[PDB]
């Protein structure tokens with residue numbers, strides 16, 4: 001279910017750490033994330049297992065990482081448990097494709 005207006009509501013879990021208006025605080029800026037390199041913001045202090053993992057943030061890699069982030073990148077500083085429903089993951093990834 002690729003819906004950006006419902007994905008803004010699921011981004012309610014992300015907005016307390018991650019900033020869409022080009023800014024890097026507790027988490028980095030999620031405006032321009034789909035297709036971006038893993039640890040690829042020169043500006044945010046990333047953990048060493050995020051730099052040693054590598055690749056780029058595709059829809060398949062994002063739905064695995066938003067299911068459990070400390071199981072996929074083993075030793076990331078992201079304190080988030082998971083999005084369990086496929087519907088909520090497809091809604092939020094459609095909003096990350098709008099904020100691209």
Ligand code: HEC
Pocket residue numbers: 010011013014015016017018026027028033036037038039040041045046047050057066076077078079080083092
């Ligand atoms: C604060 C408690 C966070 C919440 C809630 C969410 N994330 Fe986060 N995110 C946070 C940190 C501290 C980090 C950096 C981890 C590191 O290895 O240094 C991140 C990282 C992500 C990333 C990777 C970003 C990139 O490399 O460009 C993604 C894709 C990410 N987080 C996505 C995301 C989403 C969509 C969330 C809401 C469901 C979410 N994060 C919550 C901190 C926190």
